[PDB]
Design a protein around this ligand. Structure first.
Ligand SMILES: CC1(C)[C@@H](O[C@@H]2O[C@H](CO)[C@@H](O)[C@H](O)[C@@H]2O)CC[C@@]2(C)[C@H]3C(=O)C=C4[C@@H]5C[C@@](C)(C(=O)S[C@@H]6O[C@H](CO)[C@@H](O)[C@H](O)[C@@H]6O)CC[C@]5(C)CC[C@@]4(C)[C@]3(C)CC[C@@H]12
Ligand SMILES: O=c1ccn([C@@H]2O[C@H](COP(=O)(O)OP(=O)(O)O)[C@@H](O)[C@H]2O)c(=O)[nH]1
Length: 471
């Protein structure tokens, strides 16, 4: 504890994995250790500089992959080809990332599971390495249970998470493609010294800290929700990217509405719905009759469209009825969710949007799409009971307009009203969300669960540093 720790963080160029890992590095920075993010210049611009907080940037190889100069992240990508370029750009940056880390070795490396070449880098440098995927520990347990007990290849439809601490049924089977990409990353990540989770034990469940530790044989570190590291308005409003609309424009409009009278609809980054699907969402939004903040990244840069191009995805007269805000880009989600007017959230069950909703105490309407979201759907609705389900069952591998099954407006509206109409069910769901909200307020504060986990994590990293100094 006499000298601080030198920690490097290598976040992947994805909004869901860049945002949380930098906030997690800000928790290390608040303790007095020298953190350092290693990413591209555009992704490091939005990062507020704390104490000890520094970045090391290598220029994004735009013309090497074939991208415009303004695209250095997966959130600005609207095509499956773009995700390949973001990955290929990460392969080219692998050279200079390894060289910089070899020239100035840190006390510890924290790297994403999407980059599995950090294993050789930390090994030859004989330094402790931490893995990060931004999933829930509950989901990580569920995906390692399917890896030990594979589903029959023919089987499809709902399935039970095998040999779990709690009987849980996921609504659809994962794609066979998902297994071939995920399993190599989990195996390399399990070769790491520890796993960093942007969650707290009161939410994932202690029976899964004991499941991951004793059944799988690996250490996890509940350090989140790291979104709580941003306290001011400017810290909450600038995340990953500058907001598209003025943050005060949202607040002045939300301040005029009642409490729990606004629905926030955002399927996160990397999810783009076809125009038919957006039409069903829009029809179900106006049919519910509730004010809404709808994030539509599918139509960013497509403002003042001709009447033909707008009727492809919106009912005629939808924008004339000013009962909501259609944001075609980044939204201050921490700000919008924090406002007392938002009382419901239509989510893709992404983990960042999930813990941010638990902090703000907003119940969630679940619409999972890919990745860890179909496990998160059941963590929201069955395990913790802070949300209702739409009832979707399409588990795509790519979400870039790839969905082949149309979710009807009668299905969406039915779920929207189950939380906005204030029924007897919705009342106690919002009570269980407020119970977790009060707990979440001080899990990163002194004495909390995730706070003390970071205290233990630092001490063990300091120990390993003191052992290397002997040699
Ligand atoms: C196969 C390919 C298209 C890949 O192309 C290959 O590249 C290698 C490079 O050496 C070559 O050797 C091959 O010949 C070939 O060209 C490029 C892109 C790519 C890698 C994958 C990809 O970009 C992302 C995912 C992604 C992984 C995962 C675990 C995430 O964590 S995504 C992440 O978090 C959440 C998760 O829900 C997202 O919502 C966030 O926005 C953020 O992106 C799960 C989801 C997903 C989409 C699974 C597929 C893949 C591994 C993908 C698209 C497979 C295809 C692959
Ligand atoms: O318009 C948007 C879209 C996304 N986000 C942020 O992007 C992250 C989305 O992460 P999540 O894991 O929920 O979705 P994923 O990016 O994995 O699809 C969260 O921090 C959101 O607050 C935001 O602030 N505004």
């Amino acid at each position: 504890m006499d000298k601080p720790l030198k920690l490097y963080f290598i976040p992947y160029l994805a909004a869901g994995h860049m945002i949380p890992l930098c906030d997690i590095a800000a928790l290390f920075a608040s303790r007095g250790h020298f953190v350092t993010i290693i990413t591209t210049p555009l992704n490091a611009k939005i990062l507020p500089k704390y104490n000890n907080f520094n970045v090391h940037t290598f220029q994004f190889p735009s013309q090497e992959v074939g991208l415009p100069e303004g695209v250095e992240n997966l959130s600005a990508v609207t095509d499956l080809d773009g995700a390949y370029k973001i990955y290929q750009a990460m392969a080219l940056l692998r050279e200079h990332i390894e060289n910089f880390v070899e020239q100035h070795p840190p006390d510890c490396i924290v790297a994403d599971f999407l980059l599995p070449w950090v294993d050789e880098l930390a090994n030859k440098l004989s330094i402790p390495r931490l893995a990060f995927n931004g999933f829930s520990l509950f989901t990580i347990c569920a995906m390692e249970s399917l890896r030990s007990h594979p589903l029959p290849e023919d089987a499809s439809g709902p399935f039970v998470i095998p040999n779990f601490p709690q009987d849980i049924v996921i609504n659809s089977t994962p794609p066979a493609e998902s297994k071939t990409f995920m399993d190599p990353l989990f195996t390399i990540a399990l070769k790491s010294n520890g796993f960093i989770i942007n969650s707290f034990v009161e939410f994932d469940g202690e029976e899964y800290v004991k499941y991951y530790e004793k059944t799988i044989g690996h250490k996890a570190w509940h350090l989140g929700p790291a979104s709580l590291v941003r306290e001011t308005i400017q810290e909450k409003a600038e995340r990953g990217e500058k907001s598209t609309l003025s943050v005060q424009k949202f607040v002045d409009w939300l301040n005029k509405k009642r409490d729990n009278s606004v629905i926030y609809i955002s399927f996160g980054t990397m999810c783009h719905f076809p125009d038919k699907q957006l039409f069903e969402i829009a029809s179900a939004i106006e049919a519910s009759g509730y004010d809404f903040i709808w994030v539509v990244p599918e139509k960013k840069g497509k403002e003042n469209e001709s009447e033909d191009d707008k009727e492809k995805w919106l009912p005629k007269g939808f924008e004339e009825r000013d009962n909501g805000m259609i944001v075609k880009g980044w939204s201050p989600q921490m700000v919008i969710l924090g406002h007392p007017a938002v009382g419901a959230f239509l989510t893709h069950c992404g983990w960042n949007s999930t813990v941010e909703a638990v902090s703000a105490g907003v119940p969630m309407i679940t619409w999972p799409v890919l990745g860890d979201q179909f496990y998160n759907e059941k963590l929201i609705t069955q395990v913790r009971g802070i949300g209702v389900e739409v009832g979707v069952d399409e588990w795509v591998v790519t979400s870039f307009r790839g969905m082949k099954q149309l979710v009807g407006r009668d299905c969406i509206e039915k779920a929207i009203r189950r939380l906005m109409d204030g029924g007897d069910e919705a009342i106690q769901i919002r009570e269980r969300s407020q119970k977790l909200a009060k707990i979440t307020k001080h899990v990163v504060q002194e004495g909390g669960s995730s706070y003390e986990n970071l205290t233990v994590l630092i001490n063990e990293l300091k120990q390993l540093r003191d052992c290397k100094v002997l040699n």
